[PDB]
């Protein structure tokens, strides 16, 4: 049951769709804020109670701004009525050879159905 | 330039295609753990990169499922790609697979991979 | 405030004593994984941080041999402080294990640990 | 094979002593960043590895700070040394700062660095 909308804390939204064949499609969140989103998952999970592995993509440009970014989350879906996704990011931006060393931030995230 | 075939320090193979839009998508053959044949991406990149000589962000998706096998696993690799004499993609990869609430804090591995159109 | 007993989401004790120029010292229990009693660390902190709200740097090792066991391995600790009614500190980590140069590409564990006082 | 003068792809330099009791005690400098002279670091690493041909994990920490400038900041090394005629260490790091708890979210950077005797 990963289809539909999900929440973090911080006040971001997004709306995915998962197809039989593994994929995600959806947007990221006024029309200002909004990113296209895809992704893949594990459609056919283990029944020992194991959560459902997936990630998903966003690249921060859309008709209206262009950060020059683009972030990267993986982490696992795990059911029940505390349903939650629990994943760690990755975010880099383009730069110059030189300061390369410092072009990617890591951090994590959970988000909910409420 | 971003379009093409591209191998990486361990011999995998990431064969891609650049959108006008700004989408990903292609087919990834790894070199090495529990995998077999060929498998689904799929990603996004910015199509309007600044000029001053920065990279071109970039990152793609791959579930490990496929009509072979399936490891129960996901890899996202988030990157730059840089154009010149010698065109390349550096990159960073989590890789997380599905376990227990329990074994969670060891469901994720970090890496760096390096993809060049010349095999190695 | 740093020095003194701290826990984590998991368990895990992490008692400590800050020095007065960045010093880090102490032990650590972990709740899970390869491991058993006690085993030390070392480390460093930010000794004059600034005065507009914003937390206090640190980091801080362990390698996880000790005289009952040893994983050949080591994992390290990298965040921030923050004092206040909770205090607490929020930290990432990377675990790594020795390996032969083919399985190096997964070597490295990465995750994350809060700590607080109670 | 650790205790000595290493060097990194960027221009960096740092000084090690490995103790016979799994300690890291010596001195950084960088080339590149908000810091010039000299840095405290201190780690620990696996004093009886094995001989399977696996590498010797370690890891280390430098607060960047010092007698001249503040970052409020500090970086952690984990990785692990590799025997041999081109004998070297192979790290990730994480870089954390001192921020407000609306940056959170952006306080920690992530990177590789590789270390030899050149
Ligand atoms: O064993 C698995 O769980 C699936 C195979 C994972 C292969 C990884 S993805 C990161 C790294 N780069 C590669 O080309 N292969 C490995
Ligand atoms: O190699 C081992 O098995 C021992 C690793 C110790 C368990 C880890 S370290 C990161 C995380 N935080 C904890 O308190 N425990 C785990
Ligand atoms: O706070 C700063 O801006 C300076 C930190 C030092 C720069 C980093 S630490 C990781 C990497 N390895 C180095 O030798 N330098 C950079």
Same mark, same amino acid.
């Given at each position: 049951?990963?289809?539909?909308?999900?929440?973090?804390?911080?006040?971001?939204?997004?709306?995915?769709?998962?197809?039989?064949?593994?994929?995600?499609?959806? &947007?990221?969140?006024?029309?200002?804020? @909004?990113?296209?989103?895809? !992704? /893949?998952?594990?459609?056919?999970?283990?029944?020992?109670?194991?959560?459902?592995?997936? !990630?998903?993509?966003?690249?921060?440009?859309?008709?209206? /701004?262009?950060?020059?970014?683009? &972030?990267?989350?993986?982490? *696992?879906?795990?059911?029940?009525?505390?349903? @939650?996704?629990?994943? *760690?990011?990755?975010?880099?931006?383009?730069?110059?050879?030189?300061?390369?060393?410092?072009?990617?931030?890591?951090?994590?995230? &959970?988000? &909910?159905?409420?």
């Amino acid at each position: 049951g990963i289809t539909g909308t999900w929440y973090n804390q911080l006040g971001s939204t997004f709306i995915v769709t998962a197809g039989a064949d593994g994929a995600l499609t959806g &947007t990221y969140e006024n029309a200002e804020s @909004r990113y296209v989103l895809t !992704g /893949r998952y594990d459609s056919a999970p283990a029944t020992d109670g194991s959560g459902t592995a997936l !990630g998903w993509t966003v690249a921060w440009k859309n008709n209206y /701004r262009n950060a020059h970014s683009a &972030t990267t989350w993986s982490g *696992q879906y795990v059911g029940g009525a505390e349903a @939650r996704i629990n994943t *760690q990011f990755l975010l880099t931006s383009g730069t110059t050879e030189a300061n390369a060393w410092k072009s990617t931030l890591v951090g994590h995230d &959970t988000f &909910t159905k409420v």
